[PDB]
Write a protein that binds this ligand. Structure first.
Ligand SMILES: CNCc1ccncc1
Ligand SMILES: [Cl-]
Ligand SMILES: [Cl-]
Ligand SMILES: [Cl-]
Ligand SMILES: [Cl-]
Ligand SMILES: [Mn+2]
Length: 340
């Protein structure tokens, strides 16, 4: 039967089932006040699906200049055309190649650039903002969004949304690599998976995707969404409570030292955005520091709510289009305050 919600991560993660249910706030707010992330499924069904395809982005915007990142070695590919990224999104034999002759795993950097999303893509902007879940929190003028209401004593988020476009990681070696490394944001955010691209030509790597989710520490209820409902999995997240950020810094300082980095004892390895916590680092965090995280698989249409100050990392399983909006909830406004 249709139900209001369910639990993931063995009861530690709320999953809301209907993105436009006017009563969601009653379940949401209790979980949110405790510093937990929240998942809302089904947002894809509310969107105009023709607006969120890689072929449309290539056709409409393909002549713009951009930089890309090689996810495997963090190298920048400077001043290429945006079509060079999009035309390889699903067709592997069209991807830019590394010196070694392999197709590259690429991320499109800062596109649309800065705050231009609304000006460049006015129809996409309308379609996203009108269909965000928890609208009193997430809309620019929502009754519980303080972004437009705070003085300069608080860091205000840039006008959004922001897009995250990147290929899926492929090999066993790629399992230890991040699409986006561990970092934190001083505002809350909602991140929506608007498109998942399962490739062709080398499209058959369905079994390395299961070993990544399994080793990623994903829960048994999550593994059932694949095998039983045939939903398309985009990305594996790890999120940590804001209260655990300093223990995470202590671990990454210890590991930097062991790997012979030379860092001052105050340096911030989370702000550096230089680490991805692989299965080894996540076990060590748990055992040596007492810190447990939320391992989340974001499927097509899943909205991930990320609390202000919560460290998080993302590993694309397949090619993804994500769109995120920043907001400032009253629950987490401490995280953006400039004093004490
Ligand atoms: C896939 N999204 C990448 C991302 C970057 C920063 N924060 C959250 C997500
Ligand atoms: Cl548009
Ligand atoms: Cl709401
Ligand atoms: Cl990064
Ligand atoms: Cl908090
Ligand atoms: Mn982030």
């Amino acid at each position: 039967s249709m139900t209001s919600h369910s639990w993931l991560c063995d009861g530690r993660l709320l999953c809301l089932h209907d993105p436009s249910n006017k009563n969601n706030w009653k379940i949401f707010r209790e979980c949110w006040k405790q510093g937990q992330p929240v998942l809302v499924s089904g947002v894809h069904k509310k969107l105009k699906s023709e607006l969120w395809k890689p072929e449309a982005f290539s056709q409409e915007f393909g002549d713009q200049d951009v930089d890309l990142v090689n996810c495997r070695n963090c190298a920048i590919i400077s001043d290429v055309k945006v079509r060079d990224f999009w035309d390889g999104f699903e067709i592997i034999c069209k991807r830019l190649r590394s010196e070694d002759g392999q197709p590259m795993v690429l991320k499109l950097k800062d596109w649309p650039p800065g705050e231009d999303f609304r000006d460049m893509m006015p129809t996409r902007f309308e379609d996203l903002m009108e269909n965000l879940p928890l609208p009193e929190y997430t809309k620019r003028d929502g009754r519980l969004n303080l972004a437009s209401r705070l003085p300069s004593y608080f860091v205000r988020p840039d006008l959004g949304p922001k897009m995250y476009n990147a290929y899926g990681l492929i090999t066993a070696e790629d399992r230890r690599v991040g699409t986006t490394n561990l970092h934190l944001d001083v505002s809350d955010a909602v991140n929506v998976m608007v498109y998942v691209g399962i490739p062709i030509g080398e499209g058959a790597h369905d079994e390395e995707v299961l070993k990544t989710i399994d080793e990623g520490d994903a829960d048994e209820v999550t593994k059932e969404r694949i095998h039983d409902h045939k939903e398309k999995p985009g990305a594996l997240w790890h999120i940590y409570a804001a209260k655990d950020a300093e223990k995470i810094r202590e671990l990454l300082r210890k590991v930097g030292e062991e790997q012979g980095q030379e860092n001052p004892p105050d340096h911030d390895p989370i702000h550096d955005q230089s680490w991805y916590l692989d299965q080894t680092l996540r076990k060590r965090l748990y055992e040596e520091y007492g810190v447990q995280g939320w391992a989340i698989v974001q499927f097509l249409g899943d909205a991930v709510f990320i609390p202000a100050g919560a460290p998080h990392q993302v590993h694309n399983l397949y090619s993804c289009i994500k769109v995120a909006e920043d907001f400032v909830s009253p629950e987490h406004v401490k995280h953006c305050f400039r004093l004490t």
